[PDB]
């Protein structure tokens with residue numbers, strides 16, 4: 001037992017991380033087959049990236065795979081990412097996919113500087129399409145991902161930090177998550193909400209792990225719960241979310257709408273100096289899958 | 302900016318993980334050079350491990366490195382770990398050290414099942430020599446570690462779960478952390494305390510990240526703070542801890558004893574519905590080093 005915010009093993013991604021330097025900007029790139037993907041704002045000089053890229057030549061891009069130099073033999077733009085064709089295919093290329101995730105889903109971030117991995121952590125895509133990451137200057141180009149057996153699904157590439165200290169980025173096709181642009185003009189995150197289905201998943205994790213103090217036999221209808229959700233800035237719960245929680249409900253014997261009544265009481269009353277899985281807040285960055293994966297012990301390779 | 306519970310990149314350790322099966326027990330081993338290290342309780346049949354090991358032969362130990370089979374050519378006991386000599390040296394062996402950590406220090410855990418990594422997370426060695434991990438049956442032999450540039454310092458191997466759902470294990474020389482034994486007789490964790498120097502480090506992280514609401518100009522003496530610490534089951538703060546916090550104090554301009562006065566008030570008053578770095582509790586599983594590493598961006602390889 002126990003419950004931790006747990007990231008995927010990062011080895012498969014570490015082997016894809018390279019350094020990309022152009023002019024005076026250094027950031028990280030993702031080296032898959034014979035292409036290096038990186039944020040287009042690496043390109044030199046309110047910007048017009050099509051302008052800036054035609055003035056650029058292959059030899060302007062310094063790509064370093066650890067120590068070995070990578071010769072760039074072509075370049076192109078795809079939305080907000082740059083694709084640098086290099087003359088060597090990464091021999092460590094995993095089975096991979098480029099997937100775009102939904103708000104409320106989680107992924108692991110391999111934070112990198114100068115092409116070298118610094119640390120791994122888990123987070124969620126917020127309803128407002130930001131992520132609450134940990135990123136310093138030089139971290140751009142770090143990626144987020146999920147692993148399913150042996151396949152890496154890349155879902156995020158880091159581009160910027162917004163004024164509230166939250167982070168914004170693209171999928172690996174270069175399309176931003178949310179209404180953000182890779183310009184340094186004034187932009188703001190937009191109002192966020194709590195990911196209700198994840199909070200319920202985490203309450204099931206707590207029951208699986210022996211925290212039961214918040215349980216009751218008060219029940220509720222989906223409609224009556226959603227009136228309470230709206231009041232506390234929680235996202236609406238759908239019948240699909242109820243279905244997705246089915247397995248956890250079956251494992252614990254607590255009906256989904258019964259757990260909703262527990263959450264209603266927690267929202268209206270607080271926790272009264274108590275904790276749930278070591279937290280004094282209702283945690284919303286664990287998906288139902290994350291809970292099942294971590295309380296049945298699924299592995300990868 | 303941002304602040305996350307962040308683990309070391311796990312690639313270097315993933316390449317050392319193997320599966321060890323003997324009789325009907327399967328668990329994980331650590332493959333370094335031509336030795337596989339694993340918990341001695343893998344051995345077949347209130348146990349006497351010296352008895353049990355002399356009855357054992359090399360061919361009883363089934364060691365699997367992914368798909369490739371590893372031929373065991375010798376075995377010996379070292380305290381509570383078994384050392385299985387195999388006929389092949391792990392070509393992925395990193396630069397490594399076996400270090401024993403102190404209560405209050407942190408490390409990354411690569412949770413494994415059947416020799417395959419499942420996830421990575423960070424935790425601390427508690428003052429009572431347990432760890433609050435996330436471990437299910439089959440996870441024994443998973444290791445904890447820190448990385449310093451290119452060198453892996455292994456500090457923990459997982460052995461058991463105690464009745465409160467916390468975890469106990471050994472260093473890589475096979476010596477238990479704390480007063481625990483690898484028998485399934487009744488054992489209990491012992492009363493824990495909060496790691497004061499880490500809470501102060503985390504408050505400095507909060508200031509570095511823009512949370513300042515808990516600050517004040519009330520100051521305190523080390524002696525007067527430690528009277529408050531004892532009352533709230535916090536560990537004593539030493540002059541050495543004050544020195545260790547020096548750099549963070551210098552970076553933020555908040556004297557260590559001034560931050561102690563802030564912590565005094567937080568302990569006596571609570572947080573009054575507010576949060577610090579996304580938590581409604583005082584967090585104690587970040588060391589001063591963890592804070593500096595994550596707010597200056599140190600990397601590894």
Ligand SMILES: *[C@H](O)[C@H](C[C@@H]1CCNC1=O)NC(=O)[C@H](CC(=C)C)NC(=O)[C@@H](NC(=O)OCc1ccccc1)C(C)C
Pocket residue numbers: 026027041135136137138139140141158159160161162163167181182183184185186187188302
């Ligand atoms: C790439 O390594 C960095 C990573 C960035 C540095 C600190 N934390 C991070 O995640 N990214 C950048 O430097 C980008 C470059 C870009 C093309 C936009 N710039 C930023 O992240 C700035 N953010 C920004 O300009 O957002 C819009 C904005 C909002 C409010 C006022 C002005 C502009 C950031 C460093 C200030």
Ligand SMILES: *[C@H](O)[C@H](C[C@@H]1CCNC1=O)NC(=O)[C@H](CC(=C)C)NC(=O)[C@@H](NC(=O)OCc1ccccc1)C(C)C
Pocket residue numbers: 001327328342436437438439440441442459460461462463464468482483484485486487488489
């Ligand atoms: C190895 O894969 C497992 C990992 C364990 C399973 C569930 N979570 C874990 O971390 N370890 C064991 O099965 C060990 C074997 C051993 C040599 C002691 N057994 C346990 O972890 C049991 N713990 C235990 O017996 O602790 C002492 C105790 C305390 C109270 C009553 C009786 C015994 C655990 C599975 C019950």
